[PDB]
Ligand SMILES: Cc1cc2nc3c(=O)[nH]c(=O)nc-3n(C[C@H](O)[C@H](O)[C@H](O)COP(=O)(O)OP(=O)(O)OC[C@H]3O[C@@H](n4cnc5c(N)ncnc54)[C@H](O)[C@@H]3O)c2cc1C
Ligand SMILES: Cc1cc2nc3c(=O)[nH]c(=O)nc-3n(C[C@H](O)[C@H](O)[C@H](O)COP(=O)(O)OP(=O)(O)OC[C@H]3O[C@@H](n4cnc5c(N)ncnc54)[C@H](O)[C@@H]3O)c2cc1C
């Protein structure tokens with residue numbers, strides 16, 4: 001048995017920020033628990049968290065790899081010549097390079113623990129034994145052997161989320177993004193199930209690395225993918241994915257999956273349609289990872305959707321027990337989890353309470369081409385404000401008229417409170433959009449108005465200067481109804 | 488044949504002149520004439536309708552840098568598993584130039600159609616000069632004795648003729664070219680010397696390096712010790728290293744003394760130091776000077792500054808009440824979006840009853856080197872002269888994807904310079920892929936007087952290079968009454 005100021009269950013984005021800050025900034029004694037020291041099967045996430053091991057970091061490397069399919073083709077318009085029939089995409093090399101980069105990060109976190117006073121790492125499965133006792137066991141089974149018993153003044157729940165799998169016959173013949181990161185071969189025919197960012201991003205990855213004759217299909221149960229993003233951009237990215245050979249099946253949903261004699265999968269949709277693929281990747285959602293924590297031993301309250309309930313300062317209903325990150329089922333983003341962990345420790349162990357601001361958070365989708373966004377979409381703004389203006393610019397950049405990818409329209413939209421010009425949201429689609437949007441997030445913390453953008457001098461030639469060239473609204477929402485002119 | 492009369496006559500149909508002319512005609516209903524020497528790009532006069540940026544400037548050079556970037560993309564793709572016949576790769580310069588020419592000509596034609604269509608906005612072809620306070624003469628050539636094509640009466644006259652490459656007076660200067668000719672070379676040079684340490688020399692060095700034929704070599708020379716004066720010093724040193732790492736030879740503290748032709752027709756350059764270099768093309772990019780000579784400004788008494796630009800006040804007014812000047816002719820910041828801003832402000836002031844002056848501080852700009860620069864605001868040595876305590880926040884590292892691509896020399900640099908007394912951000916300086924795109928919204932931030940805490944409180948977008956700007960809370964070092972030091976005393 002060992003005594004600690006803070007015990008953190010989950011060595012992830014938020015948990016590591018909280019633990020490191022508690023130990024090095026405030027001199028506290030910190031223990032952090034995770035189930036695996038490095039990435040991959042059997043538990044996939046590990047020391048460093050989901051983003052490091054099976055999330056943002058490896059997927060961004062794989063999207064970068066997939067972008068070379070476009071670069072090799074597009075180089076021709078600028079005079080580059082080579083033998084196109086010799087091009088091939090080696091998925092094994094990609095996965096090996098990705099594996100080496102993730103493992104390097106795993107090892108560096110190991111050394112961080114070894115090198116930092118008052119910051120200890122424990123391997124195993126943590127759960128709540130009592131209000132001030134965290135127990136670490138060998139497996140997720142609550143009857144497996146006890147490895148440690150950790151007394152704690154404060155307990156932080158930071159176990160993240162896990163892929164949601166629908167209750168359909170044959171769901172056991174499907175995979176999630178966890179397994180996609182380790183496929184021995186690139187699938188020739190693949191169905192990605194879901195309309196959200198993970199399904200869209202992997203669709204682009206598989207599309208570039210598929211062997212000859214391959215086909216990527218994405219299905220989504222409603223009418224338009226990427227719910228929660230700007231509607232113009234949802235339509236345009238649909239169009240540009242299709243232009244690059246991905247088939248988008250909307251208003252369709254798998255009803256069952258069965259095994260074929262050759263090892264492929266036979267998917268039957270609710271509509272009666274069928275599709276044979278080598279791999280079915282379910283990406284319909286991610287759910288808080290609460291079941292192994294034994295929250296019933298202490299009475300930590302969950303919300304109806306399954307997150308741990310928290311106030312604005314990440315406090316549960318049980319004194320001295322806190323939760324941050326994906327387990328609170330709010331914004332599932334790594335920098336938000338980091339921010340929450342830092343605010344929590346500043347509040348508990350420092351002299352100043354701090355709460356995370358969950359509005360105006362910039363984020364991205366690494367689709368091909370990608371999305372960058374910050375703030376409100378226009379239909380959410382129209383329910384909160386009487387007069388909303390939308391400024392819109394959409395065109396194919398000159399370079400893609402030369403590259404031959406004329407379908408690659410760049411979209412830039414600014415949403416304002418028209419009563420005073422305040423910028424409520426900015427939404428971008430096109431090369432560079434995730435990089436352009438970061439400083440827009442800073443603008444929204446300075447109560448920037450549309451005139452502040454238009455009066456700034458542009459950098460030329462860029463896509464970003466479009467944001468400083470919009471003077472006149474394209475249309476409006478008045479009392480919630482869309483219209484081209486004001487009344 | 489009768490002279491024609493206008494509210495405003497613009498000499499030069501470029502970045503600033505077209506903005507002023509279009510806004511005067513379409514926003515305020517004024518009658519406008521605009522004069523330029525050529526209706527589409529290229530020899531003999533190079534610039535034309537649309538200006539220097541459209542014809543032999545930002546627009547074509549960015550397309551050519553984009554073309555040059557594919558040399559890096561093709562090599563870097565292997566680390567991510569891409570395989571193809573490397574021996575078959577060829578860079579076809581003629582196809583690049585043909586594609587660029589067709590793009591620029593399309594812009595030329597669209598501007599031509601704007602004038603043919605738009606009420607109160609007329610274009611006149613020829614050389615404009617000042618005859619008197621209210622008369623612009625349009626002649627067939629730059630020679631003031633050449634034939635008169637038109638006389639344009641004007642209540643207000645806007646000088647917007649831009650700038651021109653400067654050529655040093657050395658023996659053999661006739662064997663050298665400028666950036667104007669570089670845009671039209673029939674074949675890519677095997678060996679080329681670019682002379683100058685500024686952005687045009689650096690950018691063209693990158694272009695020639697990608698399209699050079701087998702066994703070629705690009706050399707850049709600069710007369711002082713470190714290229715890219717005026718930019719952040721950490722970035723100046725890193726750009727030098729990363730150009731060198733991509734095979735460009737950088738000769739600093741060197742300057743051509745003379746050029747002669749070898750018997751085979753190549754250029755033999757002798758430097759002041761006595762070093763020699765044999766190249767196929769010498770491109771001079773040592774500076775650009777305002778185009779005032781042909782305007783006959785003596786006829787009306789428009790004052791020039793010692794340096795040679797048209798003298799203007801904050802509202803672009805010359806010493807002659809109804810004559811104005813904007814853009815490169817004022818010999819200040821030579822950027823297309825500054826000329827456009829000045830032209831819009833002038834027209835709002837003169838015809839719009841809403842006075843406004845251009846802010847020449849905190850202007851974001853870029854260098855499309857490979858990899859590129861994005862910057863806005865003060866460099867730290869300048870800030871240290873104006874502020875008692877200056878803080879510098881700095882992040883520099885090779886991004887993970889270039890540890891896989893093999894281009895490990897590609898360190899991304901992000902620096903924020905502050906007034907440490909109150910946290911105000913004085914400048915932001917970036918080197919690396921995406922830097923020109925990242926810096927645009929930084930310019931909006933600085934115009935809103937952002938402090939370092941506004942950057943740090945903003946939640947990052949992950950994974951990006953840009954999020955480094957929102958993760959810096961502790962200064963790397965300081966300047967205290969001008970003195971650099973790791974810690975405050
Ligand atoms: C494919 C994919 C791509 C993504 N891309 C992005 C992106 O580009 N940008 C972005 O911002 N976000 C992205 N995310 C989301 C991001 O990964 C999460 O928001 C973030 O990792 C959550 O941080 P956290 O601290 O809540 O938990 P995590 O980082 O998930 O860490 C939780 C840790 O808890 C451990 N654990 C779980 N249960 C126990 C237990 N009982 N005992 C001990 N340890 C336990 C796990 O092994 C894991 O390491 C992506 C997610 C996925 C799945
Ligand atoms: C190689 C190069 C690259 C550049 N890259 C960039 C970049 O990336 N970004 C950026 O912001 N800036 C860039 N610039 C600078 C930009 O081109 C200028 O700042 C901008 O064009 C200046 O606009 P202006 O209105 O002053 O003049 P210009 O745009 O030069 O227009 C002046 C016009 O006047 C005409 N003219 C001249 N004399 C007469 C006369 N007597 N009668 C009639 N017409 C006349 C000319 O033909 C010309 O069309 C670059 C410049 C060069 C040379």
Ligand SMILES: CC(=O)N1CCC(C(N)=O)CC1
Pocket residue numbers: 196197227228229331361362363375
């Ligand atoms: C995945 C998704 O629906 N997103 C859109 C809304 C974003 C936000 N800041 O609320 C987060 C990303």
Ligand SMILES: [Br-]
Pocket residue numbers: 193194195219220221222253284
């Ligand atoms: Br779905």
Ligand SMILES: [Br-]
Pocket residue numbers: 222223224225227
């Ligand atoms: Br929908």
Ligand SMILES: [Br-]
Pocket residue numbers: 578579580581582674675
């Ligand atoms: Br060629």
Ligand SMILES: [Br-]
Pocket residue numbers: 939940943944960
């Ligand atoms: Br701060």
